[PDB]
């Protein structure tokens, strides 16, 4: 196939040749799980992860877009991305990159967080929680939407993982987002809160202290069906 | 359409398989009438077969679906047993991931809520030793599911209580009467109270495991459910 040549071209001195191969890789990465598998079998993951630390903004942006799409694959494909050392550079992009790069790094992390609990554990170990929680306040409304979804996915993990989220100070900004101006943000925030509410009694007590009950009560009379189901479930757990 | 969904459970395409599994799982969580539709569509045998496949992602979703089918009535649990679910569910307790183990324990606990013949099939499939093992090495979240499974098995007949004793359940159950979580104490005290309702030989094994001072500590608990079970078990020990 043509894939080993484009993987080789990711190391080309010619910036036009590097960008062309990177663009070709990105289109394949967005083409579904069978296409992502072809990238994995061509050894594309390791060189792609190395491009996250490149000196060119154009290269970093395309590489993070390709990585985020690979992360939309199945759990075994997320595992290959983790094994390629993607987590540390993705988490790093949250503290030093541009707002455009930050958004794509958050979208990559959210996708990895949709994996199994061991993969969520790898994100926690990579230090993703602190910068994600910081993004719930100190970011644009579009970045907030991606950050709440990443945190909701981490909240879908086991109770020890929910505990790490509480320790990262996620509860107060999440409760504040239950009455955010955007319905899409409320949808993710109520899902994350419903996930945290399914935790242990000590975690339910932390949710109560964060003022979740009056915020969820306001969401009981909501036109959105999923929001209504999540708001009711979290309230049932708070009053069980 | 359920027949096409069932056919898609043996599809080579992993996306088509996972999509059919998610659809099946949603039906399985919708109550007993919905569970009955799955049985009638012949979904249980292909579902159970997915417990052996290479993908942990597929196994996880299949276990989730089975655990929900097991929340059905006893005749529905019976169809799950007839589909060969017990041996692969028990097998997951030894080699699968902690996330898969938690779901397998929930499925087993639901099956154990069935009749005594169903509890007997769980014992014959070898559930007791790995469940007892989970009472001390697993996470607090997995311990809660394991104690609930054991409490259900302990509600069986005296011969089934005997199998729990032989599997070494008394020492860890007694230790769990002083666990930090009240939900853990609730299931631990119900299991002890059930064993206490067994024969005199079984009552003596409870006394030797140090149940009496552990139960005396709980007759002053703020939780009323814990207090009632503790009192019952204590009255059984002093007969």
């Amino acid at each position: 196939s043509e894939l080993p040549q484009m993987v080789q071209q990711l190391n080309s001195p010619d910036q036009q040749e590097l960008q062309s191969a990177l663009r070709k890789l990105s289109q394949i990465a967005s083409g579904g799980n069978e296409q992502i598998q072809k990238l994995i079998e061509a050894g594309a993951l390791s060189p792609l992860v190395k491009l996250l630390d490149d000196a060119s903004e154009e290269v970093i942006q395309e590489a993070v877009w390709a990585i985020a799409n690979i992360a939309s694959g199945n759990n075994e494909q997320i595992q290959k991305l983790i094994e390629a050392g993607a987590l540390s550079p993705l988490v790093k992009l949250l503290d030093d990159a541009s707002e455009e790069v930050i958004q794509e790094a958050v979208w990559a992390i959210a996708n990895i967080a949709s994996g199994n609990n061991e993969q969520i554990q790898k994100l926690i170990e990579a230090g993703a929680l602190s910068p994600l929680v910081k993004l719930l306040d100190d970011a644009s409304e579009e970045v907030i939407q991606e950050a709440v979804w990443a945190i909701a996915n981490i909240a879908s993990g086991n109770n020890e993982q929910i505990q790490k989220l509480i320790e990262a100070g996620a509860l107060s900004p999440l409760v504040k987002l239950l009455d955010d101006a955007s319905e899409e943000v409320i949808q993710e925030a109520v899902w994350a809160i419903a996930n945290i509410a399914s935790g242990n009694n000590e975690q339910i007590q932390k949710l109560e202290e964060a003022g979740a009950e009056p915020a969820l009560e306001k969401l009981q009379s909501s036109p959105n069906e999923e929001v209504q189901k999540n708001a009711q479930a979290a309230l049932e757990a708070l009053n069980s | 359409e359920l027949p096409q969904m069932v056919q898609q459970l043996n599809s080579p395409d992993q996306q088509e398989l996972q999509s059919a599994l998610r659809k099946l799982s949603q039906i399985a969580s919708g109550g007993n009438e919905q569970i009955q539709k799955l049985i009638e569509a012949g979904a249980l045998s292909p579902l159970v077969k997915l417990l052996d496949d290479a993908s942990e992602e597929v196994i996880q979703e299949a276990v989730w679906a089975i655990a929900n089918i097991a929340s059905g009535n006893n005749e529905q649990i019976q169809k799950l047993i007839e589909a060969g679910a017990l041996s692969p569910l028990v097998k997951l307790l030894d080699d699968a991931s902690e996330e898969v183990i938690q779901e397998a324990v929930w499925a087993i606990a639901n099956i154990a809520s069935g009749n005594n013949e169903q509890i007997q099939k769980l014992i014959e499939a070898g559930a007791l030793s790995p469940l007892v093992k989970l009472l001390d090495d697993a996470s607090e979240e997995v311990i809660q599911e394991a104690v609930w499974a054991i409490a259900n098995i302990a509600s069986g007949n005296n011969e089934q209580i005997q199998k729990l004793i032989e599997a070494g359940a008394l020492s860890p159950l007694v230790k769990l009467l002083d666990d930090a979580s009240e939900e853990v104490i609730q299931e631990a005290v119900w299991a002890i109270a059930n064993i206490a309702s067994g024969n005199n030989e079984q009552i003596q094994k409870l006394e030797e495991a140090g149940a009496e001072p552990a139960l005396e500590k709980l007759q002053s608990s703020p939780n009323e459910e814990v207090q009632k079970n503790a009192q019952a078990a204590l009255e059984a020990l002093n007969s």
Binding site: - | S25, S29, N68, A109, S113
Partner: peptide, 10 residues
């Protein structure tokens, strides 16, 4: 004791 829980994952 029969129990049914909501899936945390979407």
């Amino acid at each position: 004791k029969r129990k049914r829980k909501r899936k945390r994952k979407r």
